Amino acid sequence: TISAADIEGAIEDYVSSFSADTEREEIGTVIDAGDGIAHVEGLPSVMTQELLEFPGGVLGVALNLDEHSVGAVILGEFEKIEEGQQVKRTGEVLSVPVGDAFLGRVVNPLGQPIDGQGDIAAETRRALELQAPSVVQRQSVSEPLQTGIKAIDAMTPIGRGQRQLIIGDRKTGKTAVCVDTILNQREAWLTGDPKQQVRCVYVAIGQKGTTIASVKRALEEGGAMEYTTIVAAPASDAAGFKWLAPYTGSAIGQHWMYNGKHVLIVFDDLSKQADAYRAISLLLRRPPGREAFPGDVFYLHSRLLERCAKLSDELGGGSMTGLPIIETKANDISAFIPTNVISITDGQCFLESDLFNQGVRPAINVGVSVSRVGGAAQIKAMKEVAGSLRLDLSQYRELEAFAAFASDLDAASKAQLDRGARLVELLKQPQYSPLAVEEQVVAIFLGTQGHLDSVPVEDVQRFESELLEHVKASHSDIFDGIRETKKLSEEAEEKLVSVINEFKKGFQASDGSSVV
Amino acid sequence: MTQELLEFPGGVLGVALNLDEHSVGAVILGEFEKIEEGQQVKRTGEVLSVPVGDAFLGRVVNPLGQPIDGQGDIAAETRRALELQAPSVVQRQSVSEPLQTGIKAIDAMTPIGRGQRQLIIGDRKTGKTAVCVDTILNQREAWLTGDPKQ
Amino acid sequence: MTQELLEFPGGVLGVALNLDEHSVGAVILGEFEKIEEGQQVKRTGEVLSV
Amino acid sequence: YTGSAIGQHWMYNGKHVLIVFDDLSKQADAYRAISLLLRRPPGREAFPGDVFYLHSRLLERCAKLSDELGGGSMTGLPIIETKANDISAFIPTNVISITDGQCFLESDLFNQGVRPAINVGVSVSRVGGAAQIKAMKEVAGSLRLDLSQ
Amino acid sequence: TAGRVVRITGPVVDVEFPRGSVPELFNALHAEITFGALAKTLTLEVAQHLGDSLVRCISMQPTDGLVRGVEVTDTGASISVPVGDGVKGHVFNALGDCLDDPGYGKDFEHWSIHRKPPAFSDLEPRTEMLETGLKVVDLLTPYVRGGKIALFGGAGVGKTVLIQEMINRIARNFGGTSVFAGVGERTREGNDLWVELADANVLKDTALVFGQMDEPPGTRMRVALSALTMAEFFRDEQGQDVLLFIDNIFRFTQAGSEVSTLLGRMPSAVGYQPTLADEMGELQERITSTRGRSITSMQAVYVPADDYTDPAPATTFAHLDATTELSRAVFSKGIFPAVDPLASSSTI
Amino acid sequence: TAGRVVRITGPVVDVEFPRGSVPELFNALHAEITFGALAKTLTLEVAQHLGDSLVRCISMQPTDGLVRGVEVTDTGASISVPVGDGVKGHVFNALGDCLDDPGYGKDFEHWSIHRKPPAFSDLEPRTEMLETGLKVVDLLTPYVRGGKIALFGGAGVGKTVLIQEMINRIARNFGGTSVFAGVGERTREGNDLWVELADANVLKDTALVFGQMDEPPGTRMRVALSALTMAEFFRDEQGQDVLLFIDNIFRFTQAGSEVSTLLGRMPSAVGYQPTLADEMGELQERITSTRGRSITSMQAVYVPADDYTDPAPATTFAHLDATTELSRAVFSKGIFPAVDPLASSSTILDPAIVGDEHYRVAQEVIRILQRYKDLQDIIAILGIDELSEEDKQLVNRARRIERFLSQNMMAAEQFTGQPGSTVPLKETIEAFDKLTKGEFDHLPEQAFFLIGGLDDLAKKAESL
Amino acid sequence: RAQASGEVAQTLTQADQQLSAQGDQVRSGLESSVDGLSAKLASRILGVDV
Amino acid sequence: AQGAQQIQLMRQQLIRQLRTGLGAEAVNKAAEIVRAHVADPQAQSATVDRFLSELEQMAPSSVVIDLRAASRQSLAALVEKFDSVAGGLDADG
Amino acid sequence: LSRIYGRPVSVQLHVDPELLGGLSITVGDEVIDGSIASRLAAAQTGLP
């Protein structure tokens, strides 16, 4: 009965330490009700943006003020409000509890646990809005953030402390991308080195519970929850959560980042948040603007956004990388919210339903999707092995428009057409297939050197797979060599091409024709 | 009550649509110039009704029920209120009847029977008027038949 | 008078656009950052001329 | 409304009657004007939201009755005018979705050739063979597919 | 106790109550008509709190002949609907009073219409494959158990006969009972459907709920809630797999827009409800299977003006799993399903 | 004299004052925040009078943490900013307090930020031609000293890159005093600019001050005025030519819109300010090169939603002389210097200023591109088989001349890993005339992609 | 791995009753001194000793 | 390890049962104690005395200020005029 | 009351039977309350 004895002792200590007294606090009287809007009087001791502890356990903030009774906003069950009721105000400005035990947990935007696993404890309460770091206390981006997908890193790199944006239509798999990144982060979590250690925060807004359960189960099957912090705002809830949760994510990131930890933040959606803001602003009778959108939305998304940046070296040099996701209708960049989001940030990736329809799963456009992040993102090995890919893909896309006339090419661009086809067939990736930098740089080198030209298009994929695993089964000295010096030594080049020739001579095609 | 047929000293009529704590709105139907400040209204009768009879055949009357034509006054049988409930779902049968139209195209493509709501939609200068009037006048044989079944 | 020239202590001139029951609207032609409540407005008794 | 009441009176006693409405767009315009001048809020195309309800309480009157009440019948034939061959407007879409069966009338066909100028690829009848004479339906031989091809 | 009416306009009503008798949100109130020729009873719902012991409300019946100072009572709860085994034996509207006869009374247990979606912890974490008796349907577009499916078609393509086929298939194959909730359906079509179900000998296990055009939008928007309440009770009490049928969705959106402009709010998003997402989520959160019992439904949406980009279609497509299309040339070829395999897809 | 806060909402504040004293427009007001964590003093500027000694005012700090009844004190003056010789070499905020070295200053002269445009008698037109190593700018729209420069385009069309390209060219070629400022720029680019400027060893004579997104709009429309005041102070007393750089003025306008929405004034077209043209003209006419003072400025403008129907850049169109525009399609084609030749124009191009050969070359290129665009509609589906050879040659020449304008600036050194190139104008016009002669028809088109000069052109072409 | 999952399943089916066995003794022993705890509660509530 | 966490979860359920039992016993028994033992009238005033002690031991507090400004000035002027003018009023005047 | 507030404080008593003890005063908007029920509720709600 050791547990029983401990519980009894703790209960006795707590109940024997209970304390209360009397003070000259102030209590207001409720005079208005309806539409989550109430008015109270009897509080001369006002203090802007103080919080409320309602008798029913719900809370609110008295944002709007006037010479008469002020108009607050309530969150939760708003049906218990009645004229003449009373309310107590606390001066504790809005803040979120913070602790290192939050990882592996899913809670409401207000921090109360929702997974039902038990309870949690915090140590401080940082406010939801604070001053942002200045220019003189920042630093440049010089750290490569590795990504599971070979295509994205080969086309437009990603760096720590740098914002990258994803714009797409419905049913393209942004969830798949973020999940793949989280899974890829497991190996980085594996090492105990704080410099290489990265934490991950996911936020879902306006998402169905089935999607939440599916992604949670996928994460559990991944077994990488040791570094995950998940925030959820289900669609069926009120707009207050949909308008406040991203700030909670921002604060929880900022706390650890003032502590010197590498951080990534992923936002499921922002458009629904803008919709909720528009609706709640219209309830306020505020004059509308373009598309009934108030002009404050740009300031809102900005003040959410530029909080993510890399600090200066002296302060700790922390770096967080933000990944918002935007869904567009009828693949139009000419839309207000997409206009603002592309204007505010730098670098973006385009996904279109076309290529996904023709069959290739990763649908990335090669002519418009660009990133301004410099060459310090790539490793020098990646820089030397990969080059002129974007222009080659662009000219391939231009020249494929005249495939119907072979009287013009006449064995002048046959090699160009074949190389473009092989490269396009190479870029495709299967589902839930994490891949490391080593084998992917091997694959890009093999594709650039064109040693698979003799291989028929119908099996090239599986070809490299066999080759890949053989190099895994064979000597792995070259992988360590290019992992240490971070460059392709020449001697490794002759060794790998000799192994390639040996393997492909022993290889048979799908139809049984050996390659020469 | 709502939709009351009011009275005015100049002889014109009106109907009340919107109410208030202290005010009553109304819509003037006939002449409007005679209306002026200081007049008195009198609550008369109830919601407006129409006197329906059987002598209305072959005449042109007012929308309010006055013989605007040069013919003499019309008689009355009973007064019916405009507002009444629609027939229920327990008082309808299936539709099966050859309701003729007199046009080859209409009955060659789209059959028309009793109790079916058919809409005609057309542009300007089309021929809806001629089609409808010919359909109306096509019932001469039906009228000439002695029994009222046809 | 409607659309009549009016003079102000600052040397600027104004024109009466619309006249209400107890308020008169005026527009300032030139500098208008030295205009404060309680000044003195005087009519010239003449419609705008050049 | 008065016309509908007059028709319903005769219908309810077993007198078969038919109802024709000359134009409904002007009724909608008059209702919109009186609503706006009564100082009521405007909607899409400056139209009150209840205008549809108005037509719902107007065109629904005519129907077939059972033998319990004498088995009377009355039919409504609304007329709708359209400009520049535009169908997606508020009133046309609402009145089409509120009724069954339509008869599109094309001006180009009336310009030369067919005088009735009634479309074949657009018109449809919901009742169909239930309102057909047996000899007519048999002799017809489904020429619709023949004309389509 | 009793309340005295203050002002009236259209279907909107305003009432005053004593200081200690102010009702909460979504109550039920009763009114009576003195006029003999227009004798009628009125049901009233509370939706707003204007203050000063004054409440704005929306009636469930057309407003006519009302006189100021009429005493207003309070039922004391939300809209009460009767449930029991004797349901699905006949037809009735959201009021619960049977149209064919007033024989059905309050012997059935009465429940509140307002409910809440289930909690988050108890949601089913895995999907289940749903099998049917149609070869082409199961081969081409799989149906998720307890999911939502959209269907496109017109008259003469065998939609009603297919609905009868699937109703009797689910009735005899996996047991359970299904219900039909016709929203925005004409009276003659409803009578024809009732006669057809009666002659199909499958009317015993089906509960029919209907909504008429002449009725005010309150009934048109509470009919769906009543139907879902019926289905939830049946599932949770009998444990029977149930099927939910919905006529259209844009009619509900139009009713919501009508009540929005009626209350006098600030129309937004091309004259739409600014909170359409919240209401749609509240409606659709109560369909998903849990506790081993599946609640499947299919809905038909009418695209306005040949546009897929309208916000209402975009939002109603957000909870869709499978889409089905029926054509006319495919039926002219002489086939029963009359479904094109090329225009349909599924998410599983 | 004491002020009391009566009502506040948003960043706007309404205050009440005694009858005895009421400060005039554009005056500094001091108030404080008594809260512990967010302790800060704030300053308000006079916006308008509301009668009964009620004054509306705007803040440039966030308004959270206020409470009613706080005493309000005035200084009886407008906003003063520091001016002096040692200003350069330091970073500044909206207030003008030094950011790199706290406490640095408060010992130099102080000037207001509300001034008046110069008299018309001192105005003088200019025609001093300016040349740049980039071929396209010199051949089409040659630059004129003492004027205004416009860079029009959408979002993400390489405006920033060409901005630092030109600033590097000017800094290397020309010395003197220079001032960089802007609104609507990110922190990361600012730190990168600081690092590069330190690398160039020219930061000693450069003035740096700018805003950010996460700030109240008051700073957003006041920092530009501060920068212009610095520019005028340097121009007048020193009497030396000063380079001025301003970026993303569009945010400025947007900022004003926001505050107007808060004021409650009647909205305008597309929900804009009741009056915007007057303020635009006041801002533009502040820039003017005097007879003894040569001033050159460049402006980067953002077009919202990729639509030119907006009067936001349309109003600015009436205040510019040399304009260069960019388009999304040209970028999607592949050439980075996505400058539209068809839309671009300048007012300096005239045979009286430049010889007739350049005029003829420009006219011929313009006509060729116009004909190519005209035939683009027909070629879009059918192609050249239907078309005649007399136009097929025109199509070929248009494609080659279009691909030739591509160039490899040194600013892409951090992306392409290759050095930049520069060409004198005589070589450029000679090569373009040679191309228009059609001699280069035999050469493949791809060789013209990203080439430096005609020598490199021949070397690349013969290398394949 | 399926058989390992089954093994863990019976470990769970043993723990779920071992915890119940411990909770039985916890329930028996909870009432050892709850009266003193309630007396302390009352005393601290009243501000004076109970 | 997961099964170990469900062991901890079951211990949490035991702690939940502990919380429920403690809450029930505390509520019921404390309510009976307060409504039975100290419900006598003679104790009530004593409580007030204790309350009075609290009232005598609190630190002092500063209290001030016990609707248009022009309206306020006019009302103040009218009050001053009445005070200056009502001096000669009699009992019946 | 005169000690805490310099201005004299009037007395107006209203009897409440709900309270099991204590005393409540209201000098305007500031409120002082010592209640058996209030403290019981405070202790109960903070039990976990």
Short mmCIF file of N, CA, C and O in Angstrom, two decimals, chain A residues 118-161:
data_model
loop_
_atom_site.label_atom_id
_atom_site.label_comp_id
_atom_site.label_asym_id
_atom_site.label_seq_id
_atom_site.Cartn_x
_atom_site.Cartn_y
_atom_site.Cartn_z
N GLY A 118 -3.94 12.15 -19.17
CA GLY A 118 -3.72 12.54 -17.78
C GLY A 118 -3.63 14.05 -17.66
O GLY A 118 -4.45 14.78 -18.21
N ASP A 119 -2.61 14.49 -16.93
CA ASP A 119 -2.35 15.90 -16.69
C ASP A 119 -0.92 16.26 -17.05
O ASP A 119 -0.07 15.39 -17.26
N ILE A 120 -0.66 17.56 -17.13
CA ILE A 120 0.66 18.09 -17.46
C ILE A 120 0.96 19.26 -16.54
O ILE A 120 0.07 19.83 -15.91
N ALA A 121 2.25 19.61 -16.46
CA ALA A 121 2.71 20.69 -15.61
C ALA A 121 3.60 21.63 -16.40
O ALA A 121 4.29 21.22 -17.34
N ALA A 122 3.58 22.91 -16.02
CA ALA A 122 4.35 23.95 -16.67
C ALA A 122 5.22 24.65 -15.63
O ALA A 122 5.19 24.31 -14.44
N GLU A 123 5.98 25.65 -16.07
CA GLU A 123 6.89 26.35 -15.17
C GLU A 123 6.72 27.87 -15.27
O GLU A 123 6.92 28.58 -14.27
N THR A 124 6.35 28.38 -16.44
CA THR A 124 6.07 29.80 -16.62
C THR A 124 4.92 29.96 -17.61
O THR A 124 4.41 28.99 -18.18
N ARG A 125 4.50 31.22 -17.80
CA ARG A 125 3.40 31.56 -18.71
C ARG A 125 3.83 32.76 -19.54
O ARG A 125 3.71 33.91 -19.11
N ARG A 126 4.33 32.49 -20.75
CA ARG A 126 4.68 33.56 -21.67
C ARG A 126 3.43 34.12 -22.34
O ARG A 126 2.51 33.37 -22.69
N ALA A 127 3.40 35.44 -22.52
CA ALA A 127 2.26 36.08 -23.15
C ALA A 127 2.20 35.75 -24.63
O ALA A 127 3.18 35.31 -25.23
N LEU A 128 1.02 35.96 -25.23
CA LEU A 128 0.81 35.55 -26.61
C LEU A 128 1.44 36.50 -27.62
O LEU A 128 1.63 36.12 -28.78
N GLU A 129 1.77 37.73 -27.21
CA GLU A 129 2.39 38.69 -28.12
C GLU A 129 3.50 39.42 -27.38
O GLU A 129 3.29 39.92 -26.27
N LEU A 130 4.68 39.48 -28.00
CA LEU A 130 5.83 40.17 -27.43
C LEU A 130 6.64 40.77 -28.56
O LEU A 130 6.34 40.59 -29.74
N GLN A 131 7.68 41.51 -28.18
CA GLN A 131 8.55 42.14 -29.17
C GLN A 131 9.35 41.09 -29.93
O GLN A 131 9.77 40.07 -29.38
N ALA A 132 9.55 41.35 -31.22
CA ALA A 132 10.30 40.45 -32.07
C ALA A 132 11.78 40.82 -32.08
O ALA A 132 12.13 41.98 -31.81
N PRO A 133 12.66 39.87 -32.36
CA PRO A 133 14.09 40.20 -32.45
C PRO A 133 14.36 41.19 -33.57
O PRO A 133 13.66 41.22 -34.59
N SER A 134 15.38 42.01 -33.37
CA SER A 134 15.68 43.12 -34.26
C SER A 134 16.68 42.69 -35.33
O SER A 134 17.12 41.54 -35.38
N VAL A 135 17.05 43.62 -36.21
CA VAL A 135 17.96 43.31 -37.30
C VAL A 135 19.37 43.08 -36.77
O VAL A 135 20.04 42.12 -37.15
N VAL A 136 19.84 43.95 -35.87
CA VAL A 136 21.22 43.89 -35.40
C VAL A 136 21.51 42.63 -34.60
O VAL A 136 22.68 42.34 -34.33
N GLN A 137 20.49 41.88 -34.21
CA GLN A 137 20.65 40.67 -33.41
C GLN A 137 20.16 39.43 -34.15
O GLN A 137 19.64 38.49 -33.56
N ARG A 138 20.35 39.42 -35.47
CA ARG A 138 20.07 38.27 -36.32
C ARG A 138 21.37 37.78 -36.94
O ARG A 138 22.46 38.26 -36.61
N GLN A 139 21.26 36.82 -37.85
CA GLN A 139 22.43 36.29 -38.53
C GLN A 139 21.98 35.58 -39.79
O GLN A 139 20.80 35.24 -39.96
N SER A 140 22.93 35.35 -40.69
CA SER A 140 22.63 34.77 -41.99
C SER A 140 22.35 33.28 -41.87
O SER A 140 22.61 32.65 -40.84
N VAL A 141 21.84 32.70 -42.95
CA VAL A 141 21.50 31.29 -43.02
C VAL A 141 22.68 30.54 -43.64
O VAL A 141 23.06 30.82 -44.78
N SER A 142 23.25 29.60 -42.89
CA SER A 142 24.37 28.82 -43.38
C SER A 142 24.28 27.36 -42.95
O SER A 142 25.29 26.65 -42.93
N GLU A 143 23.08 26.89 -42.61
CA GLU A 143 22.91 25.53 -42.12
C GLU A 143 21.95 24.76 -43.01
O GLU A 143 20.80 25.19 -43.21
N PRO A 144 22.36 23.61 -43.55
CA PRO A 144 21.46 22.82 -44.41
C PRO A 144 20.50 22.00 -43.58
O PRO A 144 20.90 21.26 -42.68
N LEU A 145 19.21 22.13 -43.88
CA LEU A 145 18.16 21.32 -43.27
C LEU A 145 17.81 20.20 -44.24
O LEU A 145 17.31 20.45 -45.34
N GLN A 146 18.09 18.96 -43.84
CA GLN A 146 17.87 17.84 -44.74
C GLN A 146 16.40 17.48 -44.83
O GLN A 146 15.66 17.57 -43.84
N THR A 147 15.97 17.07 -46.02
CA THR A 147 14.58 16.73 -46.29
C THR A 147 14.53 15.34 -46.91
O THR A 147 15.44 14.94 -47.64
N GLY A 148 13.45 14.61 -46.61
CA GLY A 148 13.32 13.26 -47.14
C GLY A 148 13.21 13.21 -48.65
O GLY A 148 13.82 12.35 -49.29
N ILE A 149 12.46 14.12 -49.25
CA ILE A 149 12.19 14.08 -50.68
C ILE A 149 13.43 14.57 -51.43
O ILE A 149 13.94 15.66 -51.16
N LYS A 150 13.89 13.76 -52.38
CA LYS A 150 15.02 14.18 -53.21
C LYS A 150 14.64 15.32 -54.14
O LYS A 150 15.47 16.20 -54.41
N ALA A 151 13.40 15.33 -54.63
CA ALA A 151 13.01 16.29 -55.65
C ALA A 151 13.08 17.72 -55.12
O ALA A 151 13.65 18.61 -55.76
N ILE A 152 12.50 17.95 -53.94
CA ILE A 152 12.43 19.31 -53.42
C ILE A 152 13.83 19.85 -53.12
O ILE A 152 14.16 20.98 -53.48
N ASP A 153 14.68 19.03 -52.49
CA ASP A 153 16.02 19.49 -52.15
C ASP A 153 16.86 19.70 -53.40
O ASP A 153 17.66 20.64 -53.46
N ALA A 154 16.70 18.84 -54.41
CA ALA A 154 17.42 19.01 -55.66
C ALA A 154 16.96 20.22 -56.46
O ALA A 154 17.77 20.81 -57.18
N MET A 155 15.69 20.60 -56.34
CA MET A 155 15.15 21.70 -57.13
C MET A 155 15.26 23.03 -56.38
O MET A 155 15.94 23.95 -56.84
N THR A 156 14.60 23.13 -55.24
CA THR A 156 14.65 24.35 -54.44
C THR A 156 15.03 23.99 -53.01
O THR A 156 14.22 23.40 -52.27
N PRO A 157 16.23 24.34 -52.58
CA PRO A 157 16.70 23.93 -51.26
C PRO A 157 15.89 24.56 -50.14
O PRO A 157 15.12 25.50 -50.34
N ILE A 158 16.07 24.01 -48.94
CA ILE A 158 15.44 24.51 -47.73
C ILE A 158 16.52 24.71 -46.68
O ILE A 158 17.41 23.87 -46.51
N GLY A 159 16.46 25.85 -45.99
CA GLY A 159 17.44 26.16 -44.97
C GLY A 159 16.77 26.51 -43.66
O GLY A 159 15.64 26.99 -43.61
N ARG A 160 17.50 26.25 -42.58
CA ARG A 160 17.01 26.56 -41.25
C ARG A 160 16.91 28.07 -41.07
O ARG A 160 17.78 28.83 -41.51
N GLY A 161 15.83 28.51 -40.43
CA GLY A 161 15.59 29.93 -40.28
C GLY A 161 15.05 30.61 -41.51
O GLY A 161 14.90 31.84 -41.51
#
